[PDB]
Design a binder for this molecule. Structure first.
Ligand SMILES: [Ca+2]
Ligand SMILES: [Ca+2]
Ligand SMILES: [Ca+2]
Ligand SMILES: [Ca+2]
Ligand SMILES: [Ca+2]
Ligand SMILES: [Ca+2]
Ligand SMILES: [Ca+2]
Ligand SMILES: [Ca+2]
Ligand SMILES: [Ca+2]
Ligand SMILES: [Ca+2]
Ligand SMILES: [Ca+2]
Ligand SMILES: [Ca+2]
Ligand SMILES: [Ca+2]
Lengths: 351, 349
């Protein structure tokens, strides 16, 4: 099973105008957990390893499918897939595989953990991860966090994700983070979400609310935090439009001149997640590759997660923004089976 | 007078190898406060304004000289230079003039004020200003800050720079910030500083200390203590020892070891010691990236750096970006505002 369910929340699956985002990985038809499990086990037989075999499976499956496979191979072999892969591979390739065979929420929880363990605080990572989680997902990550602490020899009974953040963070930025982590953003019931393709988004937004919020903001303090962080992407988009109609300045522009530092970065990320997502995440990717190695984790984490949501859309944005395919940028920044893996997540298959 | 003295601390004046940094503005020989003050006053006569007149004086003077001008004008005319300039100019040119005729510490204090006032925290500005102050200067800035609060209708008796930062800041970053603001970095007596040209910097550094520090770092306020408290000279040596001992640079180590604003600050303090011209060159570039603004960071940096190492920064910029700083600035700015920036860089009209 997966603490994230068969899919990521549907709330991530539609652009502002209600159109479906395009992923690079969809649920497999005929998906056989056992079949893939057997195929993986086979591929580790012998003194060496069939990297490509392994890649063509794991990087062509969803988190849920991957998890089913883990669960399958664990009973079909009384062995631990995570362990068997770790001992059959190494270097950058092993890293990516570990990121891949871990249930998404635990994956994120670990990176949150490393973002805060250490001197200083990797705000960029907190902003990047938290921006992309909705209430239920946020809760599963917080649970998984507790497990990471246990997993890393923490005898501290009461230590929690919020515990770590509070100590780690302060000011407007802290408040805004805690809000997201509090997991109390406006919800849209699964039924309403599912019906978006049919009834549109007019169905799940509110012009009265959007107007009030716009007027509220222009008068700008938890006011901006409340609107930007709580409103659904769909609600936020509408609020953005109304705000420009009413004031002739965009909500983005407004947020930028009115806020500073990490607080600003967070707000802008949350807003853009709603109204300019493809470009937002494209830039994040670009930034994970800027200079050298190494923001390897951000790169893996983004490709792995976004692949089952909107990676294709992000890819198109990337090429149109930077003049080069995401594929090529990735190819130029990485190598080995690690590179191959990233390419397959993007949809490029080999052998 | 100036709360910063006739000059910035000499501790800013020499590169790691003891070589003098090159400014674009040096103390004027024959400098006559009154003469300049009369020339400025004449320049504002009539319904209009002789901008260039004003520019070629104020952007051609040190903070100290500018401040003596202010003080001269105030008695030679029973008028207020700041005010007279403000009412005779507007837009971006007025902005720059205001930044120019303010005593340096007050100017920085105002910026630190704006970096913290508002939602969030302009950390970039905190890092940029604090990185460039030494103990005495830091103290003058904190006193100027108290005045800025008064100046802005604050009846709060005990409110202070430290006060505002603590509220504004947390974690390893806060602690490092407070150290610098606490103004408790290793000092180098004026005598010892002045003697650098003669005795070198071997005189004012310590290999034993540097070695212990490198060993200490390779193994938490340990990093803060070394990066923030050591003089640029000591830090440079510690940098080199560290690479000999470990085969990785101190910078590389700091970067893999620390995250976020804490990292940013450490890196900036280190680079201010070992890679300064590039550091500030990139800061300048950043102030121009995208659009207008960060107009304040640009004028703050050119105005302050001009009397210390702006020429060295210019050379770095050209070699890093392939364009002269002068042309980058020319391309991003306009009007008497642009002309002013150009003159600080040494281009006369
Ligand atoms: Ca094997
Ligand atoms: Ca092989
Ligand atoms: Ca930390
Ligand atoms: Ca706190
Ligand atoms: Ca911050
Ligand atoms: Ca790279
Ligand atoms: Ca790389
Ligand atoms: Ca006039
Ligand atoms: Ca603030
Ligand atoms: Ca504090
Ligand atoms: Ca920070
Ligand atoms: Ca620009
Ligand atoms: Ca401009």
């Amino acid at each position: 099973i997966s603490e994230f369910g068969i899919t990521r929340s549907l709330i991530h699956s539609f652009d502002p105008h209600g159109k479906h985002y395009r992923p690079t990985i969809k649920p497999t038809t005929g998906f056989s957990a056992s079949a893939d499990a057997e195929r993986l086990h086979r591929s580790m037989k012998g003194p060496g390893t069939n990297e490509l075999a392994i890649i063509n499976i794991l990087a062509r499956r969803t988190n849920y499918e991957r998890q089913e496979i883990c669960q399958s191979y664990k009973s079909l072999y009384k062995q631990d897939l995570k362990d068997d892969l770790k001992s059959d591979t190494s270097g950058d390739f092993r890293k990516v595989l570990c990121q891949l065979i871990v249930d998404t929420p635990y994956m994120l929880a670990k990176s949150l953990y490393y973002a805060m363990k250490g001197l200083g605080t990797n705000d960029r990572v907190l902003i990047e991860i938290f921006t992309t989680l909705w209430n239920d997902e946020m809760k599963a990550v917080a649970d998984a966090y507790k497990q990471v602490l246990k997993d890393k020899g923490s005898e501290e009974s009461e230590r929690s994700l919020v515990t770590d953040m509070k100590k780690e963070t302060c000011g407007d930025y802290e408040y805004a983070l805690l809000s997201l982590v509090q997991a109390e953003r406006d919800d849209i019931p699964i039924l309403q979400l599912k019906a978006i393709p049919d009834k549109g988004v007019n169905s799940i937004i509110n012009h009265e609310l959007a107007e009030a919020d716009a007027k509220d903001l222009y008068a700008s303090e938890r006011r901006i935090t409340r609107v930007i962080c709580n409103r659904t992407p769909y609600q936020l988009y509408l609020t953005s439009e109304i705000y420009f109609k009413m004031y002739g300045k965009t909500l983005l522009e407004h947020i930028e001149s009115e806020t500073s530092g990490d607080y600003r970065k967070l707000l802008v990320a949350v807003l853009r997640y709603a109204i300019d997502r493809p470009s937002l995440i494209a830039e994040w990717l670009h930034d994970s590759m800027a200079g050298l190695g190494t923001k390897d984790y951000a790169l893996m984490r983004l490709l792995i997660t976004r692949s089952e949501i909107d990676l294709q859309d992000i890819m198109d944005a990337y090429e149109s923004i930077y003049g080069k395919s995401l594929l090529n940028a990735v190819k130029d920044d990485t190598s080995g089976d690690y590179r191959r893996t990233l390419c397959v997540l993007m949809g490029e298959i080999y052998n």
